[PDB]
Each structure stands twice: as structure tokens, then as C-alpha cells.
Amino acid sequence: PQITLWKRPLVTIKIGGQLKEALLDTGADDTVIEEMNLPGRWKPKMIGGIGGFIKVRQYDQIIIEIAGHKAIGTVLVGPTPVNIIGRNLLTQIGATLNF
Amino acid sequence: PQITLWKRPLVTIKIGGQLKEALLDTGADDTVIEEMNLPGRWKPKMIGGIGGFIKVRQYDQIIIEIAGHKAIGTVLVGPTPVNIIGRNLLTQIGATLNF
Ligand SMILES: CC(C)[C@H](NC(=O)[C@H](C)NC(=O)OCc1ccccc1)C(=O)N[C@@H](Cc1ccccc1)[C@@H](O)[C@H](O)[C@H](Cc1ccccc1)NC(=O)[C@@H](NC(=O)[C@H](C)NC(=O)OCc1ccccc1)C(C)C
Ligand SMILES: Cc1ccc(S(=O)(=O)NC(=O)NC2CCN(c3nccc(C(F)(F)F)n3)CC2)cc1
DSSP states (O other): OEEOSSSOOEEEEEOSSOEEEEEEOTTOSSEEESOOOOSSOOEEEEEEETTEEEEEEEEEEEEEEETTEEEEEEEEEOOOSSOEEOHHHHTTTTOEEEO | OEEOOSSOOEEEEEESSOEEEEEEOTTOSSOEEOSOOOSSOEEEEEEEETTEEEEEEEEEEEEEEETTEEEEEEEEESOOSSOEEOHHHHHHHTOEEEO
16 A cells, blocks of 8 residues: 555554554554453553653564554553554564655 | 665754754654744644643744755644654655555
């Protein structure tokens, strides 16, 4: 695809039989989601935001379809105001910024 | 150019006749920049993201060069831990997410 940026880059993501939407986010080191019935336990983490720092729940080896493409990685769950797909998962599906 | 994303996409910018580096941020609705005086009048605004909210001086019709591409737009001035060229100005230089 070749997505223009006049609106938010929200794409259909799927994860362990859960259809959702998410934000392709070139300024996000990590992928961060609001909830999902993920692999039980989670090693805790801290992530950096514009308005301070938040505590999240890290889950690894996570299979996720993004916009068609398959991806494997580290989905954090945290108090995010929108499902964010960061560079860790954007790399694998070949996603690049262009101008 | 075509920017892969294994690292942060920081680029050279020129703003207020001052050279900076700044992160190309497709999740950001607005453009946010660290302290500096710009010309013209500002008006208060709060923006929010991860961690919570910050306060900003919003400036308008602010001429800005980005990886050597000219652009007029709204630019927010406030204490971000990083300069962010969000979607408002990305649409001007013709930026797209390609995969
Ligand atoms: C996703 C995170 C991992 C990411 N943070 C990082 O990658 C940081 C630097 N690194 C990191 O987490 O590494 C691990 C760690 C941290 C420190 C040391 C060791 C361990 C991040 O906060 N990403 C943001 C940029 C950033 C990075 C460096 C430091 C400061 C800010 C935007 O790209 C990202 O797009 C966010 C997510 C998002 C998108 C849209 C909606 C709300 C939040 N947007 C924003 O912060 C922007 N806000 C918006 O687009 C609009 C204007 N506001 C909004 O819709 O907010 C309403 C909202 C606020 C409050 C609660 C409910 C709703 C923007 C203006 C800066
Ligand atoms: C391989 C390939 C090359 C070129 C193209 S394109 O057709 O010249 N450009 C384009 O289509 N832009 C927009 C429309 C489709 N869209 C999108 N693309 C993928 C996945 C999702 C979804 F649903 F999950 F959200 N949405 C937004 C961008 C296509 C394919």
C-alpha cells in the first residue's frame, strides 16, 4: 500500500482471533495496545510518552496479522489512548516512510 | 528518499532560521517542537498522548524546511522530550507509508 497522512493511519490488525484497528506509528519504538486475552503472565515494563511515563504489560512471541501481513513480536498492553503499531513490528512487514 | 525503520527516523529541519533534528511521527496529529521564540502570535492549547497531557503555544502559518523540503503550517511549542513533525506537515511534503 501507499498510505497518505490526511487522516490517522488506522489499519485492520488481528491477534489470537481478535479483529481490531491500529495506528501505524513511525515515532513509536514499541507496539502498544489497550487490551487482549494474551499469554497469561507478563514481565512489567516502563514506556516513554509526551506527558510522562507509563507501566505496561510485555508479551513476547506474539503472532499478529497487520493489514494482511504476518508478524511476530513484543506487544505491550498499557493505558494507551489508541492501538499503536510501532517500529518493532513495522520493520518485518517492510514498512517505510517515503517523500 | 525511502526511510526504512530499524532506527528512529530523525531528519534535519530548518525552523526560525535555526537548524534542528526532528522525528517523523505518523501517529502525531500535530507538530510539536521544543522551546524557541517564533514570529507572530500564539494561542494556548493542550495536547495529550502517552503519559498524559502537556501545554503548548500554538503558532500558525510557520514556514519550516524538512529534509530540505519547504512547508507552511501550524507548529506547537512546548516541552516535548523530542521534536515531532506530525501528520499536519507530513501531508505537505508528500510523505507516505509504503509496504
Ligand atoms: C508508543 C511509545 C512506545 C512511544 N514512546 C517511545 O518510543 C519512547 C521515546 N521510548 C520507549 O518507550 O522505550 C522504552 C523505555 C522508555 C524510556 C527509557 C527505557 C525504557 C511514544 O510515546 N510515541 C509518540 C512520540 C513520542 C516519542 C518520544 C518521547 C515523546 C513522544 C507518538 O509517536 C505516538 O503517536 C503517540 C501515541 C498516540 C497517538 C494519537 C492519540 C494519542 C496518543 N502520539 C502523541 O503523543 C501525539 N498525540 C496526538 O496525535 C493527539 C494530538 N492527542 C490525542 O489524541 O490524545 C488524547 C488522549 C490523551 C490522554 C488519554 C486519552 C486520550 C503527539 C501530538 C505527540
Ligand atoms: C503491493 C501493493 C502496491 C500498491 C498498492 S496501492 O493500491 O497503489 N495504494 C493504497 O492502497 N493506499 C490506501 C488504501 C488501502 N489501505 C490499506 N492497505 C492495507 C491494509 C489496510 C487495512 F485495512 F488493514 F487497514 N488498509 C490504506 C492506504 C497496494 C499494494
